[PDB]
């Protein structure tokens, strides 16, 4: 009861800000991990032969697209912020807006992380495959592009959830 009351009495603005920051942080972390995964294979292939640098750069660009989408989502969330008035600090509208912001941020961050990991693994495999044979680069690039859609879907879901903000 008293513990439950204290839990229900937590400030929603703090949770909303935490989710907003966490979305960008997780997107950046996932993009960096995918970039490193792709870069290891790209550097190995270049050491083997520098002929496929242009083909390899596509994986890096795709990985950075996740970071770009995360940054856009973070900017949108920052735009979604309000003044947080003292009177409505515990109003139902404020609590709903904070919960929606936190949920959208968590969803965006998790989707960005998953998409970044998948893209990094796909690019790491694809660079080695291209080093084995340049004829298979087209199919590998198509597969990577198809797998990159996870981040776009997560961003779409986060944008849809962002409309729920109604902080007075």
């Amino acid at each position: 009861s008293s513990w439950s009351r204290a839990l229900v009495k937590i400030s929603p603005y703090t949770f909303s800000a935490i989710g907003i920051a966490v979305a960008i942080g997780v997107s950046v972390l996932g993009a960096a991990w995918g970039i490193y995964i792709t870069g290891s294979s790209l550097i190995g292939a270049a050491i083997k032969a520098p002929r496929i640098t242009s083909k390899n750069l596509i994986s890096v660009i795709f990985c950075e697209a996740v970071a770009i989408y995360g940054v856009i989502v973070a900017i949108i969330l920052q735009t979604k912020l309000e003044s947080v008035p003292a009177s409505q600090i515990y109003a139902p509208e404020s609590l709903r807006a904070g919960y929606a912001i936190f949920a959208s941020g968590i969803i965006v961050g998790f989707a960005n992380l998953v998409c970044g990991l998948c893209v990094g693994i796909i690019g790491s495999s694809c660079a080695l495959s291209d080093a084995q044979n340049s004829s298979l680069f087209v199919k590998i690039l198509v597969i990577e592009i198809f797998g990159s859609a996870l981040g776009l879907f997560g961003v779409i879901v986060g944008i849809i959830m962002s409309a729920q903000a109604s902080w007075p």
Binding site: W33, Y36, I37, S40, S41, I43, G44, A45, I47, K48, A49, L117, G120, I121, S124, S125, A127, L128, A131, Q132
Partner: protein
Amino acid sequence: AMTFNIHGGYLEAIVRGYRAGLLTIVEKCTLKLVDEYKHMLPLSTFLEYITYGHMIDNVVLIVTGRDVQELLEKCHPLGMFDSIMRELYRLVLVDTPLAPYFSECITSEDLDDMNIEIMRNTLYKAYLEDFYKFCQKLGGATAEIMSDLLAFEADRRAVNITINSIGTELTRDDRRKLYSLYPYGHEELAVCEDIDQVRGVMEKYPPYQSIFSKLSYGESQMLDKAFYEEEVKRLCLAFEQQFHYGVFFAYMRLREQEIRNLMWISEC
């Protein structure tokens, strides 16, 4: 899964590229492969075990003397590294995985390592110790390949023992006591004194079934060639080399097989 990208990715890519590029000429190719392997310097332990594989044979050869100075001519860095006669054996007991065990198992020195047959027995014991050490480093799909190689060596030794080395005290008990499913079911080969008996013993493993076939070739050779030739023939399985896995040993084995094929080519 992410550990491969965390570390070892560049080395794995370089090894894959070198293997894909692969296909006194034999000596030159062996020297080039050894240089490529050395220039590559977690995976450090795997490389050490892979080198120790041939280093066991190199140390066994160096254990002679008896024209011992000729061992410098075959100082291939791939297997004949300097870092890898009981007084000298104790000194050589360091920097090798199988050496500490062979110090006690082969404490008789030349008495248990006579160049006629007992030297081969000591080499087989060292190979068994090295195979056990390699199998200890479990965690990857290479455990199956290592087990297959050890089984092939043990079965070839057992076949050689039953063929003619039985008169050299390589009896049924010696088929596993000195001659290096095999780690659990090698007892079936203790009574395979005939080629038909060898085929019947191989029938206990359906994958090993029909591998012996007429046994005119492969099984015809003594020492470790009988079932090792079966592994050489089936090495097309090793040619798969699925990605994101330890393939350094596979690349080394492929390079060794290519060198052996080039040597067997010789003057056409």
